[PDB]
């Protein structure tokens, strides 16, 4: 019954196990119906406890089929024989029998070493990569849909030419591309390319995220704070409202994260904010003065995927 | 090699998976040889990546047999048949073939429901308990020693009468009792009872912990502050030095936790701190003016275990 992820979703990166169960419970009870997960976030079992508690309880008013659940194939599981195994492990942890969506997390194949390092690195701090064609990984992802383990598959951090090439050999097309989009990195050409080619888009770090002590770039933005103040809301909600007005299609969704119940609830009201054309112009100007790609493997893995 | 846990250990409660690997690696490389873990800390797999890496090759300089590794049976696994199952799971996560010590985490048997809630509570917010005699659980713990899965077994949060009764039914004696001990909760009568009966003692929250937002009571103490200042050290090293001078026996250990590399290294120098007899009297008087048991299930589970 859902064709694409619900427009307003909920992220789980960096939420420790001890916070994320309460966070997901709060999101679900607040009304979010799209939860973004990943194996590499090291918290799927805690999330699964939230799903089990809510979906098994006929009193919560929320059933499994009301919720879109996404997870992601980690970089060290790109060898085809590892794809189904991780899918099943992720589902077991999440206490689900199927995923709505399973993504290739990055177009980077990491070695899977004998201690199971999530981020294997050589002495220079560069990620240790494995020889796995992206098409081999994709074919393995397709088999998950054929078996019925997952309803849809997609990609994340794929660039235009990777998407173009995928479209030329995919038997099952990627449902979406999940990529970094926010007022400091609007990513317009790539979004348009996806949507023009019938691929949905999911905006990660939609409020600018928590990145290098980690900082929240949104807290320094005078433009977002001025619009928020004048409208009796938060800069967070103004950012989220900007996404959904800018790209007014059910094929585009946002996945804001908080592990703080008050913020989870407050962010859910972003759909009530009405931005003017002047508001949209002002926000669209932010990246002309400050443009930043935060989630850049050139930085943390010494692999310049986006160059 | 080790009859009792090394005196200076390292705790891992509340360390998220994303921080705890680095934390454990920092501790081991600094010189700690006692790592305190638990299933319920939701981070054993991350800790395992540290152990797996370090113990794989002699080139690290630290062999498995150089390190004392403790874990703990969670409250929902008191049913005898669940004890070995959890022991094996814990060990798989930690990437070890044996534990030096496996503890009964609490003398509370929680129900293990169909969604695996770690903290099952009723409508009134009270923990939901299961009918499992403590002696039944203990017999199942003894089997782990007979099989060779663990070298030693022990208890945590056991009171004097529970310990007396255990000594009377045990075929394998508990090696230690792990309990809350710090300047605000010196726990003298219980410590003395254990040691007098040939049961070791491991001091958890040795610096007063991070507890109800969460606060560190040690940073408001003018007594530890004045002594730390006088001796050119931290209140943290003074509190740790107090423990090891007060109870000067190989049977008594402390497990200070930090997920912060600089603090992990700094705490390890507590052994160089030379406290005087008047320093000891000053620290010993703190609980007369401020006595607090932080880790009290009367608060968070509505079960008054310590009353
Ligand atoms: N490669 C990938 O596919 C990829 C990469 C990045 C992210 N993602 C996904 O996208 C999700 C969202 O991105 P993100 O987590 O990077 O960043 P984000 O959602 O843009 O921002 C998260 C940060 O904002 C804070 N925050 C949220 N609401 C707030 C409010 N109302 N007031 C004040 N602070 C607020 C959070 O703090 P608290 O939590 O402390 O409240 C956290 O520090 C992730 O969780 C993950 O699911 C995917
Ligand atoms: N029921 C049980 O058997 C039980 C119960 C509680 C604890 N435990 C065990 O006992 C261990 C120790 O107890 P604990 O973790 O409750 O409390 P603790 O070790 O007394 O104190 C931990 C707190 O002190 C901070 N800290 C440590 N060293 C510091 C320094 N040098 N400077 C500034 N801050 C410092 C830590 O912050 P950062 O980490 O942010 O640096 C953390 O907030 C636990 O981790 C666990 O393994 C067992």
Author numbering:
A (entry chain A), B (entry chain B): 0 to 211, 219 to 313
Give sentences from the paper.
Aldose reductases (EC 1.1.1.21) are ubiquitous NADPH-dependent oxidoreductases that catalyze the reduction of aldehydes to alcohols. G. lamblia is the etiological agent of giardiasis, a common cause of diarrheal disease in the developing world. Typical aldose reductases exhibit the TIM-barrel fold with eight α-helices on the exterior and an eight-stranded β-barrel in the interior.
G. lamblia aldose reductase adopts a TIM-barrel fold with the NADP+-binding site located within the eight β-strands of the interior. The two monomers of G. lamblia aldose reductase superimpose with a root-mean-square deviation (r.m.s.d.) of 0.3 Å (on Cα atoms); a search of the PDB for structural homologues using SSM/PDBeFold yielded several structures of human aldose reductase with Cα-atom r.m.s.d.s of 1.0–1.1 Å. Cofactor binding by Arg269 is conserved between the two structures. The side chain of His242 of G. lamblia aldose reductase hydrophobically stacks with the adenine of NADP+, while this residue is an alanine in the human protein. This histidine residue is not found in other aldose reductases of higher organisms and may be unique to Giardia. Residues in the active site and anion-binding pocket show conservation in sequence and structure with mammalian structures, while the nonphenylalanine residues involved in forming the specificity pocket show divergence. This structure did not resolve a flexible loop involved in solvent sequestration of NADP+. The C-terminal loop formed by residues Pro303–Leu311 diverges significantly from the structure of the corresponding loop in the human and porcine structures.
